[PDB]
Amino acid sequence: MKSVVNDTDGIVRVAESVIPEIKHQDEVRVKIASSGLCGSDLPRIFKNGAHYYPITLGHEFSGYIDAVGSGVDDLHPGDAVACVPLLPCFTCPECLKGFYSQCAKYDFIGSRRDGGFAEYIVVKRKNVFALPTDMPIEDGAFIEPITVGLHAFHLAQGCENKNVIIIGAGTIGLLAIQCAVALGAKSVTAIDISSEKLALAKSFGAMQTFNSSEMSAPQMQSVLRELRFNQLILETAGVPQTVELAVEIAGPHAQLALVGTLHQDLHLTSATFGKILRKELTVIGSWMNYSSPWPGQEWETASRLLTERKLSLEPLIAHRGSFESFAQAVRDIARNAMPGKVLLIP
């Protein structure tokens, strides 16, 4: 079979390998239909940053059960599934309480072990999530990214009837925008430096957009006046300036979910820090995309939205293609910005 492997840095080869076999009673083999590229893979490929090389990445994928171990009885050949890439231990105090993303002894498909840029993959049963027969299998590769946004909403106790503000119009942000609309947010506002990403977000249901290269935080807070109550702000860009921005625009008692990891230090003036207190913000750190019971309601809601077609995936997809097409397109972007979602369709 084929697979995409990248080595000490840059080089993305397309490889031939022995079909992987089931080696534990709790494993299943998946035949992969759709597998997408993540923002987090770019560093692993083009800035070192991967746990080892050569490696096979890919943790956003769907497909069909091809075989199951002697111990799995609730799955069967033909069953549609999406990959659940994190594997917590399930038995430590964090896991018992449902804090799987704070488990210290973890594996992760496509990072700590090879992933789904491949024709077949063997994973633990725990690492697949059954999908309805009625969901287009290809959209299955979007479930893990969608759950990023839903997990933040879950932590905030839901986006319903709230004035949600999404900061960052990348795939995560844009998926969050569509979910907020589908789940009955009172309003959805999108904030980004690109007027193009913003128009896109507007086409997804954001009733208004703020271009943060043109509009001031005050300017924004001014526009936000009528919707300053019950805010749920999602910071998805992961840069000091947008974390700072979220705090400065925040309405009274706004919830602030951080899903974006920083790679530069955060410098909050005493004034900005003061606004966290003065406004009585609740800042919610969000990690990964899971809850109890495993893998979490986030995965059911995501699956449901996808099956009842409330989401619009095409404008998010930059590339469809098999192993060479995908490899090349991955090489094309390099250390630059990701156009949109790059899908591997074997």
Q: Where does this chain bind a second copy (CB under 8 A)?
A: 93-94, 97, 99, 101-102, 155, 229, 243, 252-253, 258-259, 261-270, 273-287
Taking CB within 5 to 8 Å according to partner kind, which of a second copy, Zn ion, Ni ion, none is near residue 334? none
- CB neighbourhood size of 300 (10 A): 13
Hey, is 22 helix, strand or coil? coil
Q: How far is the CB of 231 from a second copy (least distance, A)?
A: 13
Q: Which of 25, 70, 71, 89 binds Zn ion (CB under 5 A)?
A: 89
Q: How far is the CB of 141 from a second copy (least distance, A)?
A: 24
119 is annotated as contributing to ligand binding: no
Taking CB within 5 to 8 Å according to partner kind, which of a second copy, Ni ion, Zn ion, none is near residue 38? Ni ion
Q: Which of 267, 270, 293, 337 binds Ni ion (CB under 5 A)?
A: 267
Q: Which is nearer to Zn ion, 85 or 346 (CB)?
A: 85
Q: Which is nearer to Zn ion, 92 or 318 (CB)?
A: 92
Token output for 250: 């925040």
Q: What are phi and psi of 295, to 5 degrees?
A: -90, 0
Question: 289 to each of 144, 167, 259, 334, how far by Cα in Å?
Answer: 8, 18, 10, 27
Taking CB within 5 to 8 Å according to partner kind, which of Zn ion, a second copy, Ni ion, none is near residue 264? a second copy
- Give me the amino acid identity at 238: G
What angle do the packed helices 143-155 and 297-307 form, to 10 degrees? 120
Decide if residue 193 touches Zn ion (CB under 5 A). Answer: no
Q: How far is the CB of 257 from a second copy (least distance, A)?
A: 10
Of 99-107, 146-154, 242-250, 275-283, the segment contacting Zn ion by CB under 5 A is 99-107
Of 40, 41, 39, give the one whose Cα is nearest residue 4: 41
Token output for 45: 């490929």
Of 47-55, 265-273, 309-317, 332-340, the segment contacting Ni ion by CB under 5 A is 265-273
**Contact predicate 207/181, CB 8 Å:** no
Q: What are phi and psi of 233, to 5 degrees?
A: -100, 125
**Contact predicate 36/63, CB 8 Å:** no
Decide if residue 227 touches Ni ion (CB under 5 A). Answer: no
Q: Which residues contact 155 (CB under 8 A, 6 or more apart)?
A: 257, 284, 286
Q: Which of 68, 83, 103, 224 binds Zn ion (CB under 5 A)?
A: 103
- Concatenate the DSSP letters of all residues of 108-154 into one string: EBTTTB--SSBSEEEEEGGGEEE--TTS-GGGGGGHHHHHHHHHHHH
Taking CB within 5 to 8 Å according to partner kind, which of Zn ion, a second copy, Ni ion, none is near residue 54? none
Q: Give me the residues paired with residue 107 across strands.
A: 87
83 is annotated as contributing to ligand binding: no
Q: Which residues contact 21 (CB under 8 A, 6 or more apart)?
A: 29, 122
Q: How far is the CB of 170 from Ni ion (least distance, A)?
A: 11
Q: Which of 32, 38, 302, 329 binds Ni ion (CB under 5 A)?
A: 38
Decide if residue 95 touches Zn ion (CB under 5 A). Answer: yes
Q: Give me the residues paired with residue 3 across strands.
A: 15, 118
Decide if residue 287 touches Zn ion (CB under 5 A). Answer: no
Q: How far is the CB of 38 from Ni ion (least distance, A)?
A: 3
* Residues flagged as binding site for Zn(2+): 38, 59, 89, 92, 95, 103, 144
* Residues flagged as binding site: 38, 59, 89, 92, 95, 103, 144
Judged by the rule CB under 5 A, the positions of this chain that interact with Ni ion are 38, 267
